[PDB]
């Protein structure tokens, strides 16, 4: 079982193989936001703010900034991650005869799949949300300007796409882990008894 557990070397291979797509997204975001977004603070009024946000969106495009590459990158990661973990799990199931040892490998493979994917999703999601930079918001900023600004910048749409990836990661993790994080109904009924919880 030397090479199993979706270890750091295997996770680094997948990150390396998709590293080109990202470039230095953080550097690109920081350079872009410094150059094009500061004027948002001086918006004369609500209408003017939204107008400046649309201009910021047009400037993102002119700078080849699109969240489509970030969504593809995450899709690439889930597929390669799931593929490797599924190979490791099935290989472990065919070769490991110690049933407790097998369960430990299954838990480690699936845990590392789950945390690998969730951490990259969080990193990409934070990057995307930061294209509405809070330090440059105007002092009269309210919730409806913020919402519409999220829509204009494509951040709202990216958030919807995240639902699909998160749901997909969730199903794949449920498969890889055989759901062992969560109790059976009988195990749960017994723990509620032992814990002396009175529910409802």
């Amino acid at each position: 079982g030397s090479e199993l557990g979706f270890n750091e070397a295997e996770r680094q291979k997948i990150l390396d193989s998709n590293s080109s797509l990202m470039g230095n997204a953080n550097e690109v975001r920081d350079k872009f936001i410094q150059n094009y977004a500061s004027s948002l603070k001086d918006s004369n009024d609500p209408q003017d703010f939204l107008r400046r946000v649309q201009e910021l969106r047009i400037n993102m495009q002119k700078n080849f900034i699109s969240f489509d590459v970030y969504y593809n990158y995450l899709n690439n990661l889930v597929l390669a991650s799931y593929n490797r973990c599924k190979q490791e799990k099935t290989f472990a199931e065919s070769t490991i005869k110690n049933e407790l040892t097998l369960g430990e490998f299954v838990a480690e493979i699936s845990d590392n799949f789950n945390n690998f994917m969730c951490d990259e999703v969080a990193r990409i999601s934070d990057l995307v949300a930061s294209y509405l930079p809070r330090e440059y918001l105007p002092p009269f900023i309210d919730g409806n300007m913020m919402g519409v600004a999220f829509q204009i910048l494509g951040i709202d749409d990216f958030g919807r796409k995240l639902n699909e990836i998160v749901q997909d990661i969730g199903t794949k993790y449920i498969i890889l882990s055989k759901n062992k994080t969560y109790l059976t109904s009988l195990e749960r009924a017994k723990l509620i008894t032992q814990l002396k919880l009175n529910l409802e």
């Binding site: 934070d126 749901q167 109790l183």
Partner: protein
């Protein structure tokens, strides 16, 4: 008497494999992740010519977050020990009324006054009532992931109340 959560599989009762899954107000799907995002779409449908879709998209995310918080607290060993320890009040089977009520946060017994109180999610999970960080750590990776995304978007200081309003609106049939 109909409860859609009665047809959501919170626990580890069904054998779920790729093979089984390939064959497949109640959401379809054989696994919790499919079912809960499906149910979120029934509660917060995607209206075609909808005004501000951001608030409803983020209210829909909040629904999924609240249901995962319920599952992590009430359907894991360490979650149930945390619920006992913290004197959290949650039902044995969630209801639409209860999930709508999580918009205000976590119901628990205040240890000082021994009276029931509500602590906002923002304070309770990673917030000022969780400087320890232990509350956030009892949640699963996906729940923390979604909760992180939410705080950068729908849960931002300017929009949170609007999102909560849209969220609570969907539960008007139940209050």
């Amino acid at each position: 008497r109909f409860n859609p959560f009665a047809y959501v599989d919170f626990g580890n009762d069904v054998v779920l494999t790729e093979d089984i899954l390939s064959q497949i107000m109640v959401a379809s799907g054989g696994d919790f992740s499919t079912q809960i995002f499906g149910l979120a779409k029934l509660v917060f449908p995607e209206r075609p010519n909808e005004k501000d879709p951001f608030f409803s998209n983020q209210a829909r995310n909040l629904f999924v977050i609240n249901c995962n918080i319920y599952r992590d607290l009430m359907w894991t060993k360490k979650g149930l020990e945390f619920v006992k320890r913290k004197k959290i009040i949650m039902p044995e089977t969630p209801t639409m009324f209860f999930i709508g009520s999580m918009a205000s946060g976590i119901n628990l017994i205040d240890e000082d006054t021994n009276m029931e109180k509500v602590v906002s999610l923002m304070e309770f999970f990673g917030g000022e009532e969780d400087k320890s960080g232990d509350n956030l750590r009892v949640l699963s990776p996906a729940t923390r992931n979604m909760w992180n995304s939410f705080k950068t978007m729908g849960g931002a200081r300017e929009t949170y109340s609007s999102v909560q309003g849209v969220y609570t609106s969907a539960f008007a049939p139940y209050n």
